[PDB]
Amino acid sequence: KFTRSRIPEKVFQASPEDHEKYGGDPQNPHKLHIVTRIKSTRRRPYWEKDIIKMLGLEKAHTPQVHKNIPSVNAKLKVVKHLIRIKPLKLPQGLPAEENMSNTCLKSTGELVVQWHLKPV
Amino acid sequence: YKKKWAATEPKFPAVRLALQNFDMTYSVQFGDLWPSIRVSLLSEQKYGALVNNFAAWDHVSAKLEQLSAKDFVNEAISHWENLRCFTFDRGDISRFPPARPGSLGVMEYYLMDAASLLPVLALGLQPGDIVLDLCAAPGGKTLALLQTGCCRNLAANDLSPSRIARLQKILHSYVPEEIRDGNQVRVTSWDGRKWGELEGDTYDRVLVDVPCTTDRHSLHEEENNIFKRSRKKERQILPVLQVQLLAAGLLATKPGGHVVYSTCSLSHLQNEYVVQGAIELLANQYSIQVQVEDLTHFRRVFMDTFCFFSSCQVGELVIPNLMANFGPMYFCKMRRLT
Amino acid sequence: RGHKGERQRGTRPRLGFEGGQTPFYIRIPKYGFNEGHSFRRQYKPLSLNRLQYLIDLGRVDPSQPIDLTQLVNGRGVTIQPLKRDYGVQLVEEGADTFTAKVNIEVQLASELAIAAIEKNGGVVTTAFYDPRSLDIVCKPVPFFLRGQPIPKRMLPPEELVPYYTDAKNRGYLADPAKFPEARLELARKYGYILPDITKDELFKMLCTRKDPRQIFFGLAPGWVVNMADKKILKPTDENLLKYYTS
Amino acid sequence: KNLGGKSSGRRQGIKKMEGHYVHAGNIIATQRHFRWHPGAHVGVGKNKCLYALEEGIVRYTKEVYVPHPRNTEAVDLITRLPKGAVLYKTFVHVVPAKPEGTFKLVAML
RNA sequence: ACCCCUAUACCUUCUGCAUAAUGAAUUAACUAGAAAUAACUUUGCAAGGAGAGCCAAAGCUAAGACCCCCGAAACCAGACGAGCUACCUAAGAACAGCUAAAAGAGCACACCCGUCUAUGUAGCAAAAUAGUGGGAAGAUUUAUAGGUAGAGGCGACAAACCUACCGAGCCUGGUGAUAGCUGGUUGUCCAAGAUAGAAUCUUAGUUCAACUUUAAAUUUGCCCACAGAACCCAAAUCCCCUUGUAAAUUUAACUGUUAGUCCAAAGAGGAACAGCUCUUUGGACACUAGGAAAAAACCUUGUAGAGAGAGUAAAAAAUUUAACA
RNA sequence: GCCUGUUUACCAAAAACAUCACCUCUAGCAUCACCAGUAUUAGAGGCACCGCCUUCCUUAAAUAGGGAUGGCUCCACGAGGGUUCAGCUGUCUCUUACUUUUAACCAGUGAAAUUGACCUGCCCGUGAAGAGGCGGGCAUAACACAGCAAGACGAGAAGACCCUAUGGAGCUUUAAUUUAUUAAUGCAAACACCUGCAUUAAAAAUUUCGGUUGGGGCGACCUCGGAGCAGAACCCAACCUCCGAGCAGUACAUGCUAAGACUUCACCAGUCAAAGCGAACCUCAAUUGAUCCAAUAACUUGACCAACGGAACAAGUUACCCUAGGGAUAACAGCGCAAUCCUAUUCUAGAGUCCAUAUCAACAAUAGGGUUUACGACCUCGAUGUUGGAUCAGGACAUCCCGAUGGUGCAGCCGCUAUUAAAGGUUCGUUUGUUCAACGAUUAAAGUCCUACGUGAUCUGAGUUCAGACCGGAGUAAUCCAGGUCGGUUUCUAUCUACUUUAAUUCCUCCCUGUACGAAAGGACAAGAGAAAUAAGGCCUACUUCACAAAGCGCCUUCCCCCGUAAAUGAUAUCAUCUCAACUUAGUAUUAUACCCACACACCCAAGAACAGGGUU
Numbered sequence A: 001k002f003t004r005s006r007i008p009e010k011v012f013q014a015s016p017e018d019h020e021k022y023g024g025d026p027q028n029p030h031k032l033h034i035v036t037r038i039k040s041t042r043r044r045p046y047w048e049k050d051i052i053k054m055l056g057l058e059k060a061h062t063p064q065v066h067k068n069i070p071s072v073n074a075k076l077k078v079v080k081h082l083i084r085i086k087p088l089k090l091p092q093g094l095p096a097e098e099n100m101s102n103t104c105l106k107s108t109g110e111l112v113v114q115w116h117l118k119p120v
Numbered sequence B: 001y002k003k004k005w006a007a008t009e010p011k012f013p014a015v016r017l018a019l020q021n022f023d024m025t026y027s028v029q030f031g032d033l034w035p036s037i038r039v040s041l042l043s044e045q046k047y048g049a050l051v052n053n054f055a056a057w058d059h060v061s062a063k064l065e066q067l068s069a070k071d072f073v074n075e076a077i078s079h080w081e082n083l084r085c086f087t088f089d090r091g092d093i094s095r096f097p098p099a100r101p102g103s104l105g106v107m108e109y110y111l112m113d114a115a116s117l118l119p120v121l122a123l124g125l126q127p128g129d130i131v132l133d134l135c136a137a138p139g140g141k142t143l144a145l146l147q148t149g150c151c152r153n154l155a156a157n158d159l160s161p162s163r164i165a166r167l168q169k170i171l172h173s174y175v176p177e178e179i180r181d182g183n184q185v186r187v188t189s190w191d192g193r194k195w196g197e198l199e200g201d202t203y204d205r206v207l208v209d210v211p212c213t214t215d216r217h218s219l220h221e222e223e224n225n226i227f228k229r230s231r232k233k234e235r236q237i238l239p240v241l242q243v244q245l246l247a248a249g250l251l252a253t254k255p256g257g258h259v260v261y262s263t264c265s266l267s268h269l270q271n272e273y274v275v276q277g278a279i280e281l282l283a284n285q286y287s288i289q290v291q292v293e294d295l296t297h298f299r300r301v302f303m304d305t306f307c308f309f310s311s312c313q314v315g316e317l318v319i320p321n322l323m324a325n326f327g328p329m330y331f332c333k334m335r336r337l338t
Numbered sequence C: 001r002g003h004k005g006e007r008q009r010g011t012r013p014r015l016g017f018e019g020g021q022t023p024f025y026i027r028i029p030k031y032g033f034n035e036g037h038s039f040r041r042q043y044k045p046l047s048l049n050r051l052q053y054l055i056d057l058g059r060v061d062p063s064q065p066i067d068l069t070q071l072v073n074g075r076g077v078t079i080q081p082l083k084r085d086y087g088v089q090l091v092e093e094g095a096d097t098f099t100a101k102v103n104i105e106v107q108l109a110s111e112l113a114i115a116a117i118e119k120n121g122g123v124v125t126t127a128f129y130d131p132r133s134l135d136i137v138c139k140p141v142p143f144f145l146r147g148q149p150i151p152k153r154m155l156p157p158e159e160l161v162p163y164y165t166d167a168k169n170r171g172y173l174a175d176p177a178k179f180p181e182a183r184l185e186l187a188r189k190y191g192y193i194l195p196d197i198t199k200d201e202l203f204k205m206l207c208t209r210k211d212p213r214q215i216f217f218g219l220a221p222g223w224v225v226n227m228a229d230k231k232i233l234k235p236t237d238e239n240l241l242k243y244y245t246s
Numbered sequence D: 001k002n003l004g005g006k007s008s009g010r011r012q013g014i015k016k017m018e019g020h021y022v023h024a025g026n027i028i029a030t031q032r033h034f035r036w037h038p039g040a041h042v043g044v045g046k047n048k049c050l051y052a053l054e055e056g057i058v059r060y061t062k063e064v065y066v067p068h069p070r071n072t073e074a075v076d077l078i079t080r081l082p083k084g085a086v087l088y089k090t091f092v093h094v095v096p097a098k099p100e101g102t103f104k105l106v107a108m109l
Numbered sequence E: 001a002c003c004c005c006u007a008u009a010c011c012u013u014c015u016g017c018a019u020a021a022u023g024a025a026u027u028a029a030c031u032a033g034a035a036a037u038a039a040c041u042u043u044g045c046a047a048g049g050a051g052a053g054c055c056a057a058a059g060c061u062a063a064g065a066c067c068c069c070c071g072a073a074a075c076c077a078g079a080c081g082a083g084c085u086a087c088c089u090a091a092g093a094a095c096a097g098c099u100a101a102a103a104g105a106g107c108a109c110a111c112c113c114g115u116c117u118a119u120g121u122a123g124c125a126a127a128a129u130a131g132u133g134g135g136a137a138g139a140u141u142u143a144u145a146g147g148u149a150g151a152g153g154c155g156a157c158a159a160a161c162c163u164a165c166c167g168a169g170c171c172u173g174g175u176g177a178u179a180g181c182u183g184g185u186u187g188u189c190c191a192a193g194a195u196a197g198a199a200u201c202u203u204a205g206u207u208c209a210a211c212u213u214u215a216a217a218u219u220u221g222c223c224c225a226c227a228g229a230a231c232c233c234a235a236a237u238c239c240c241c242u243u244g245u246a247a248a249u250u251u252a253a254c255u256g257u258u259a260g261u262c263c264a265a266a267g268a269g270g271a272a273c274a275g276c277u278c279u280u281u282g283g284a285c286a287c288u289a290g291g292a293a294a295a296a297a298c299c300u301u302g303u304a305g306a307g308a309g310a311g312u313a314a315a316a317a318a319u320u321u322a323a324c325a
Numbered sequence F: 001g002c003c004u005g006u007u008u009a010c011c012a013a014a015a016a017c018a019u020c021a022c023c024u025c026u027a028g029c030a031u032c033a034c035c036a037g038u039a040u041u042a043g044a045g046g047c048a049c050c051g052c053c054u055u056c057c058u059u060a061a062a063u064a065g066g067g068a069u070g071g072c073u074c075c076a077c078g079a080g081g082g083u084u085c086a087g088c089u090g091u092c093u094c095u096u097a098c099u100u101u102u103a104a105c106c107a108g109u110g111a112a113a114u115u116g117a118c119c120u121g122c123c124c125g126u127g128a129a130g131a132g133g134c135g136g137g138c139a140u141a142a143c144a145c146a147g148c149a150a151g152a153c154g155a156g157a158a159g160a161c162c163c164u165a166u167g168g169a170g171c172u173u174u175a176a177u178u179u180a181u182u183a184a185u186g187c188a189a190a191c192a193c194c195u196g197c198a199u200u201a202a203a204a205a206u207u208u209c210g211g212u213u214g215g216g217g218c219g220a221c222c223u224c225g226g227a228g229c230a231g232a233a234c235c236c237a238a239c240c241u242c243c244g245a246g247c248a249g250u251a252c253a254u255g256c257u258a259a260g261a262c263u264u265c266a267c268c269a270g271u272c273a274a275a276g277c278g279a280a281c282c283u284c285a286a287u288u289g290a291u292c293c294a295a296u297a298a299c300u301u302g303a304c305c306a307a308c309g310g311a312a313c314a315a316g317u318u319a320c321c322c323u324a325g326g327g328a329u330a331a332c333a334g335c336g337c338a339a340u341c342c343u344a345u346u347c348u349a350g351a352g353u354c355c356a357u358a359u360c361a362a363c364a365a366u367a368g369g370g371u372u373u374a375c376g377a378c379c380u381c382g383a384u385g386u387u388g389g390a391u392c393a394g395g396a397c398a399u400c401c402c403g404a405u406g407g408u409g410c411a412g413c414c415g416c417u418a419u420u421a422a423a424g425g426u427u428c429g430u431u432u433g434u435u436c437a438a439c440g441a442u443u444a445a446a447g448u449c450c451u452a453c454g455u456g457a458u459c460u461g462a463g464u465u466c467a468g469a470c471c472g473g474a475g476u477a478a479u480c481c482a483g484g485u486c487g488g489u490u491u492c493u494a495u496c497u498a499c500u501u502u503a504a505u506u507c508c509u510c511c512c513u514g515u516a517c518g519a520a521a522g523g524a525c526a527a528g529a530g531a532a533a534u535a536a537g538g539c540c541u542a543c544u545u546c547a548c549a550a551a552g553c554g555c556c557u558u559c560c561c562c563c564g565u566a567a568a569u570g571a572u573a574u575c576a577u578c579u580c581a582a583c584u585u586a587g588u589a590u591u592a593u594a595c596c597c598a599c600a601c602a603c604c605c606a607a608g609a610a611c612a613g614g615g616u617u
């Protein structure tokens, strides 16, 4: 029968080679995920559909910010094959109230607190 | 499916089918005796009253004697040179009063075919003998064995849980729970054919009452008649099953032990060929030699009460007569020499 | 209407049919839950709370005897004789707050209701009414328009005779000698001093009680009420007088 | 030639898992034969169903199994065990939650 | 205008129809959802409401809103039918010629019938024409009038005939018979919306459950960390705080759906065949579009409009092979 | 079947019905039949006159035909069913000529079924599974007129056949319920008749004929429980695998009550149970049954209602049938599948006197095919029976013959086997529906298949399929039958698509030649010549049917390959090697050509349906 898939934990234990390849430090892990649905929930189990709805990824190619905490990670593990996960990078720290209306999420995963739309 | 057939075979009652078969076979088998056997089988069956040794046996025997029944077993022992079953004189058709519980809480006597007791008597249960009843589970012979002195335990097996339950009920009604509690009585719902593997060279005395055509019951009872068309396969394969059961019993019995093969049918095929085939199969496949005991003295001793088919090669055959409607009962005694 | 089948064809089975299975409303054994329901007597409850409320709002005048006619006129209770209503039963509900001195006539009365009525200085009597007399009492004006003489009030049925002859129930047919004993027993049981109504200035009104065969207080059986000209015709024939007095 | 065998499932098993709050009398688990044995404040019905005798929390544990001496078959089974062996069974307990009552001031006589 | 590219009429019945499954030549006209119970909304009055009766532990009064059409073979009652045909009654008629003689004789006209062949098959004809053929003084053919009438008649029994269609006539009436069966069921627009089973003279249906819809109440619903769920003799599941979420349960009312398909997986039967038959988990299909050639079920992808903008998803088969001492 | 007669008006004329004769049963009698009669009579019925008793032949070939109380007995007769001598003839070999009708054109008049719209092609594939409409190719100006019937699963009856419906109806019954009605009696009432009530029959009347499975049977099952399928909460089917139950034993507190829970997926029903009163100090798988209704003072009890959620009481048969539907459900057919079937390779066991591999072939293995017997129920049940035969054939090659090669247990001739080749051909008769088969005679051969087991709007209906009737058998009967037999209505005027004038083969004879080969007996190739036969295309000088002409039975002409291998030179690999090495031959298709080629009224015609065409000097 087709059932829910239990991913062995060793799959989610990064190696030094992975750290070098993907540019992430196991110490000081990133706080927030940017998750995009890059795959349709159609022809997937109703539980994956429900997990996508819970995570708020109904629209594809629409980034959503989520906490990098074990429960959200469990959900993202359930629906990992339909999504792209990247760290949220904050070169200028989290936006302040002053610049909350001038933010922009770069395709690189960086939330710039200033967005002037002018040449550098 | 095809609904409209050209000619449908006439719908016969199983009783009439059994009559047809018994005619076409036993007429040839017995010649001029077949008329008498047929009328005896179609007439009422003469019953014997086996007094429950556990109950007030002396009092019940006195009451039956007052009812004018005499102990055929006792008179047989008189000229033989522990069982008590009373039967009426030759020609008498009187019925024994229905048995009722005694003062001790057990039925005073069992109303059973007298011929059914001859196998047990011929088995000759010595004091303290380990006993097996491979498939005998209608009651009757089993109760007679228990009333005998097989204090070294008796294993009564059958393949039919319904008949096992019937055995258990008659044991509750007749045999005291004190007697039945220990391993003195072990009732099982297993196949006799497997019994050779389950136990071998264990029992000193064995009784193999194989399923058979039960001629009288086939002629009388319409329900579950062996001669009905649906059970044609079982009827045809009966000889092989009987041979297998007798072989299992012979394997089970200890070397030098005695077995008795019993059948409630007149069929030469189901009796003499069955015993001979069992002997041959045992001596070939398992290389064990069995010698058929001579029961001619038994025939002469019990002739006064039962009429026997003199022209019998192996074993004894009580045939039902009007003067004594006790048959049919074939029984063959076999001592396992090796 | 769906697609084909009995439901679309408009010919689905009757209500309660279960497709041939023995229906639920038929596989349950018959029991006498409603046997003789149309013959069981019914009495409209009249709580002392409702009685006090009516007295307070003035829809019921305690200065005059209170009977079923007065209650109906004040709209304190609705009676349906056609529905086997045999009258009004006094209900103890509101006894602890009842503070009205009234002379009330009912058909049934609880012990506590009687106790409260008597403690407040009033008088309560349980009076039987046959269905016809009850209908006349509840709606007298239509009866007067029917143009028939006022009929006699029938006696209670044999089963009800003991109730209305027992003094403890203040039965209108009970022995008046036993009334003081019953009232004293109630007063002793419920811990209030029995007020001697004979000293009350309204003692006459409290003592007024219609004759057992009488329906209205001042009208005798056999009289005819001509409402058109405001008159009452009284038969004088000896046979009629004897019949209406019997 | 194979008849019968159309009996439906008995819907037996555990009705209250570990940690579930259970009121007195609630059936905890129904079994055909003793899969789970009664523990503390757990009673057994005629059909070997386990019900809560007190209002509390259900807990499943493993405990050494010492049957009643009158239980002849179990006693013989034990008698055949080696010296070091100790039987174990799964038991269901109800940890009572509330106290069985409190003392209240009724009258200041 | 065509040429270019895209496009497999509609309705109904279906798991699924361009389907070579049904209906339709077409125009006009006519042609098919009728209602209580209890609910909901809106008023009135209110512990009472109502124009007697009835209801009432906020009810009661009033209104609004809700339930199709065509079609059997049949059954029964009363009439009408023997101008056809079956048989019979009365009183009539016909039967050349030859042969044999007095014939249920022979050949053969009239006459009656209808063996075989061909034509015809909406025909000349709702049973005929041509030839051929049987009888043709007899149980023959036939004109006239009368008679037997339908749970009946009559019958050289073929279940034949009884006014072209008799295993039981025809007409009228009950009758708008009934039909779990077939077909049909007519303005616009939006929205939610698809199958656990049980019982059944029941498997072409229906009642309940499940699912679904609407309105209302308040409160946890789903996902789910440990801990936890058996001895005999695998994938997973259940329970489940956090967490991400916003749904869940209950109350009131009510229909409809309960003849399913293929794919992946675990099985059972078959032959480790079937586009084969069953059960279980999931997906898709009965719903849009793109792709695999065409394509219900495979892959991508969905929430809907306009644009003569843009980035992408799935998405194109691969291979060529034998010397030898 | 005795005969004459009768019958299904309108698919059966008969062996069926009747029939004289014979036989069985019933009735002793008059004023409406019988009958104006009386046992030699009348009625009902059976049966069929009379009479009597008790392997060979046919053919050449033969599934054909004939002969070795009841039962025999064919004299006569028969539009009955078979066989047959002789003759006859266009039935046929093998078709032709002519006349009339029809037909086509001109003139008048002028329907019918049918029809979703059509701007209406072919091949392959796809698909609700056989497409004009979809995908990829190919083709493609436009229209008339006349033919054809391959398709439009063509048009005609909500076809034929099969299944279903808590649909009908006819019939039979030992189906259930009745005896209202008649005929008998008996008891009452009256003094035989009448009436009432009973009993027995006859006669009828009403109603029903459960469900799931099983094609070659002579049935099984229907409710409940345990185990696997369903491994671990629950749940889980089967026309799946096994095993069981319709109780028994104890006790008599096996009493009363009551929180809270479980629950067979609904309900109904079924389970467990704290506490309390009162007492002492039930078990295990299932072991069953609702309502109503009966019995009972009450307590309580009652169906093997087992078709086990249970109609209170009802079976068969229908082909005499009917209606409503079903491709949801059968048979032909199509479509899946390849168990079975067939073919080819691998392996060498073994045969082949020795020898695996000339040839055959075991166990097995691998592929290919969709020609058999099955399985599946996916399209079609809202007019297509089916098998054979006639006619015309299209196609595959897994080749029967003819052609070219290799091997051989190939001396030659015969052969066997394998590769290549589908241009052409592949007979006529007897029995029998018969395909097939057997038999007779031939042939170079008398190939295996597919094409809706090709083709039935082109034909036939011989078997088989409805109504009729027999023999045998089943059944109480009505009726039935995979059996045998006799008979039995085969419609369509063509709207659309498609189509309607496109270098031969073989046998035999002779020569080579009774030569090669061989010891002989036998006996070849190649090449050449002559005769025929068929097939195609023409023609009428003869002959013949006939007659200003059309025809065959008459005459004339018919013309090239195809390639499997056998070799030369020669490397990779200095030999060798025919070469998916370069290369040289047998070796050729690139059919060679032939035919046709003129843009321009009326009459006749060898030209023709019309139109068109040729001649008019």
Ligand SMILES: Nc1nc2c(ncn2[C@@H]2O[C@H](COP(=O)(O)OP(=O)(O)OP(=O)(O)O)[C@@H](O)[C@H]2O)c(=O)[nH]1
Pocket (backbone or CB within 6 Å): F292, F293, F302, F303, F312
């Ligand atoms: N509860 C119950 N009711 C029964 C039983 N037998 C009969 N009945 C009732 O009677 C009906 C059956 O009627 P019948 O079949 O005539 O009964 P019967 O006893 O066989 O015969 P009669 O006495 O002639 O009625 C049932 O439906 C019940 O109403 C039974 O064993 N139990």
Ligand SMILES: [Mg+2]
Pocket (backbone or CB within 6 Å): C004
């Ligand atoms: Mg419809």
Ligand SMILES: [Mg+2]
Pocket (backbone or CB within 6 Å): D005, D006, D007
């Ligand atoms: Mg089971």
Ligand SMILES: [Mg+2]
Pocket (backbone or CB within 6 Å): none
């Ligand atoms: Mg169509």
Ligand SMILES: [Mg+2]
Pocket (backbone or CB within 6 Å): none
């Ligand atoms: Mg249809």
Ligand SMILES: [Mg+2]
Pocket (backbone or CB within 6 Å): none
């Ligand atoms: Mg049409």
Ligand SMILES: [Mg+2]
Pocket (backbone or CB within 6 Å): E082
């Ligand atoms: Mg007439």
Ligand SMILES: [Mg+2]
Pocket (backbone or CB within 6 Å): none
């Ligand atoms: Mg004449």
Ligand SMILES: [Mg+2]
Pocket (backbone or CB within 6 Å): E105
């Ligand atoms: Mg004549």
Ligand SMILES: [Mg+2]
Pocket (backbone or CB within 6 Å): none
């Ligand atoms: Mg006639």
Ligand SMILES: [Mg+2]
Pocket (backbone or CB within 6 Å): E157
């Ligand atoms: Mg007949």
Ligand SMILES: [Mg+2]
Pocket (backbone or CB within 6 Å): E159
């Ligand atoms: Mg007939």
Ligand SMILES: [Mg+2]
Pocket (backbone or CB within 6 Å): none
């Ligand atoms: Mg007519």
Ligand SMILES: [Mg+2]
Pocket (backbone or CB within 6 Å): none
């Ligand atoms: Mg109708």
Ligand SMILES: [Mg+2]
Pocket (backbone or CB within 6 Å): none
């Ligand atoms: Mg929507």
Ligand SMILES: [Mg+2]
Pocket (backbone or CB within 6 Å): C020, E201
């Ligand atoms: Mg029923």
